[PDB]
Amino acid sequence: RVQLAHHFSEPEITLIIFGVMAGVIGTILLISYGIRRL
Amino acid sequence: QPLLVVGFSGPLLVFEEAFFSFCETNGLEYIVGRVWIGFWLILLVVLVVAF
Amino acid sequence: GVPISILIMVLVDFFIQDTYTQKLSVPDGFKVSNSSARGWVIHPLGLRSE
Ligand SMILES: CC(C)CCC[C@@H](C)[C@H]1CC[C@H]2[C@@H]3CC=C4C[C@@H](O)CC[C@]4(C)[C@H]3CC[C@]12C
């Protein structure tokens, strides 16, 4: 039908969401690797 | 374990009932909220499988 | 055994033309269930409202 306009398209926006997701995941893995060592 | 059959179930139906009853009350989008219950579930499953 | 049970009985209600029994109903084609609500790919920021 009629779709509300967005600055980001669907593929661009899911790319950004998955990138922020993977960044959070990697930060958590790095933090957990920091613990159990010192 | 390929012998498992993956399909819809009763508790999932009940959850979708609750999600519609919540999105209609708050004037929200029922399917966009689902697109965020999935974007968060990917985080949850990746963290659980990782540890 | 199960495929034979279904075949034998599918035939029993097929050859009974007059009475009416509910059959399996499947959609017409590979389309979304409500074309007036959503499409195939769905925007994370919303369809009608932000
Ligand atoms: C686990 C998943 C859900 C990540 C967590 C979501 C949070 C942390 C982040 C991830 C991606 C982010 C979104 C990415 C893109 C946009 C579009 C922009 O015009 C407004 C902000 C908005 C809507 C962001 C809001 C915050 C956001 C939703």
Side-chain angles (χ1 to χ4, degrees), chain A residues 2-37, chain B, chain C:
Chain A
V2 189
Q3 172 99 266
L4 195 64
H6 277 130
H7 184 255
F8 311 94
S9 69
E10 303 89 358
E12 301 164 353
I13 211 187
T14 173
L15 154 74
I16 313 301
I17 302 264
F18 283 152
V20 159
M21 223 188 86
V24 169
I25 288 167
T27 304
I28 291 178
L29 311 183
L30 287 174
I31 287 175
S32 64
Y33 219 163
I35 327 291
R36 303 181 168 87
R37 167 170 284 179
Chain B
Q1 187 64 89
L3 263 64
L4 304 169
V5 180
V6 186
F8 210 82
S9 52
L12 278 173
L13 193 81
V14 174
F15 182 80
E16 303 279 350
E17 294 273 17
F19 204 42
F20 202 85
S21 212
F22 180 82
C23 274
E24 198 81 13
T25 304
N26 283 19
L28 294 181
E29 296 243 60
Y30 168 74
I31 218 74
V32 183
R34 283 187 78 262
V35 185
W36 291 104
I37 298 182
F39 270 147
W40 267 110
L41 264 167
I42 293 181
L43 216 80
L44 264 194
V45 70
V46 164
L47 276 206
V48 168
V49 169
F51 291 68
Chain C
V2 170
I4 283 324
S5 323
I6 307 181
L7 197 33
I8 285 162
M9 285 288 143
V10 155
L11 298 179
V12 166
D13 137 80
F14 169 98
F15 289 126
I16 302 181
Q17 180 184 3
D18 284 331
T19 301
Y20 149 88
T21 43
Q22 200 176 1
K23 310 289 189 297
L24 282 148
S25 184
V26 276
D28 279 9
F30 292 4
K31 299 129 188 303
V32 317
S33 296
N34 196 337
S35 61
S36 296
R38 55 67 69 84
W40 278 115
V41 200
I42 273 186
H43 212 108
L45 282 166
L47 277 302
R48 300 307 205 276
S49 178
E50 258 339 80

